[PDB]
Amino acid sequence: FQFGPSIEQQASVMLNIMEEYDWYIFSIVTTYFPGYQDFENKVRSTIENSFVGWELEEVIHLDMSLDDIDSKIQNQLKKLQSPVILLYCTKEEATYIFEVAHSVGLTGYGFTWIVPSLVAGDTDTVPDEFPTGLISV
Amino acid sequence: FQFGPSIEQQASVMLNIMEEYDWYIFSIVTTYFPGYQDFENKVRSTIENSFVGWELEEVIHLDMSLDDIDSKIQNQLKKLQSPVILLYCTKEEATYIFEVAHSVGLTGYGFTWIVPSLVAGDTDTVPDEFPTGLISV
Structure with a gap:
C-alpha cells in the first residue's frame, strides 16, 4: 500500500478543477510518456458523458526522443x-x-x-521555467 | 531617367497578381521601412474601389530597430x-x-x-531563408 493515486483519477480532478472555474474550453498537450491516449481515453469518457458542450481543441503527441533542431514542439x-x-x-x-x-x-x-x-513531483524544487499561475494537483 | 518603377505601381501589380489567381483574402506584413501606410493607403484605394468583397485581415508594423529578445515579430x-x-x-x-x-x-x-x-533585389543572390514559392515582382 501507498499513500498515492493514479492517472485517471488525476484527470478527473483536473476536470473537476476546470468545471469549478467553469473553464469549458481546453486542449491537451501530452507526450509519448506512459499513460497517453488512456489519458485521452479517460478524458474522452469523462468529457463525453456530460451533457455540457465543452470543447476539446487539440491533442498533441510529441516524442521527447529524437530531440529537435526543428523546434517541432x-x-x-x-x-x-x-x-x-x-x-x-x-x-x-x-x-x-x-x-x-x-x-x-x-x-x-x-x-x-x-x-x-508528476510534473510538480516533490514540489521542493521548482525551476522557474514553469510559468506562474500553473495549476496542479 | 531610369529603367525602373515605384511603390504604388508595384502594389498594383501585387493586386493584379492576386486577382489573377483570384486570391481574395490577404494580409499585409510591413515594417517601418519607407513607404508604409502609403503602401497601405494605395492598397486602401485600390482594394476599396472595386466592387468585390476581398478581405484585408491584418496590417502589421514592426520596427527592425529595437531588435528583439522578445521575438515580438x-x-x-x-x-x-x-x-x-x-x-x-x-x-x-x-x-x-x-x-x-x-x-x-x-x-x-x-x-x-x-x-x-526590393526584397528580391538583384536576384543574383538568394539566401534560402526565403521560402520557396515566394512570389515577387
Whole structure:
C-alpha cells in the first residue's frame, strides 16, 4: 500500500478543477510518456458523458526522443489558441515544453495550464521555467 | 531617367497578381521601412474601389530597430491566419522575418507570400531563408 493515486483519477480532478472555474474550453498537450491516449481515453469518457458542450481543441503527441533542431514542439504548440491547457509529461520534459511555451507565448495571461501529479513531483524544487499561475494537483 | 518603377505601381501589380489567381483574402506584413501606410493607403484605394468583397485581415508594423529578445515579430506574425501575405521591408529584414515565419509556420503550404521589388533585389543572390514559392515582382 501507498499513500498515492493514479492517472485517471488525476484527470478527473483536473476536470473537476476546470468545471469549478467553469473553464469549458481546453486542449491537451501530452507526450509519448506512459499513460497517453488512456489519458485521452479517460478524458474522452469523462468529457463525453456530460451533457455540457465543452470543447476539446487539440491533442498533441510529441516524442521527447529524437530531440529537435526543428523546434517541432514550438511548431505544434504555437498553433493552439485555447485558454486552458492540460499538460502531461516527465518533469524535465515539462521544463523543455515550458521554455518552448515561453517562446511561443502560450504561458502568458488568459491562457492557463493544468498539470497532473508528476510534473510538480516533490514540489521542493521548482525551476522557474514553469510559468506562474500553473495549476496542479 | 531610369529603367525602373515605384511603390504604388508595384502594389498594383501585387493586386493584379492576386486577382489573377483570384486570391481574395490577404494580409499585409510591413515594417517601418519607407513607404508604409502609403503602401497601405494605395492598397486602401485600390482594394476599396472595386466592387468585390476581398478581405484585408491584418496590417502589421514592426520596427527592425529595437531588435528583439522578445521575438515580438514572432508574437505578431504567429497570430495571422490568412492564406495570402504581402510583405514589405528591407532585403535583410526580409531574411529575419522569414526565419521568424519559418519558426511560426507561416511559410508552409497553402499560405503564400507576395513581395514588391526590393526584397528580391538583384536576384543574383538568394539566401534560402526565403521560402520557396515566394512570389515577387
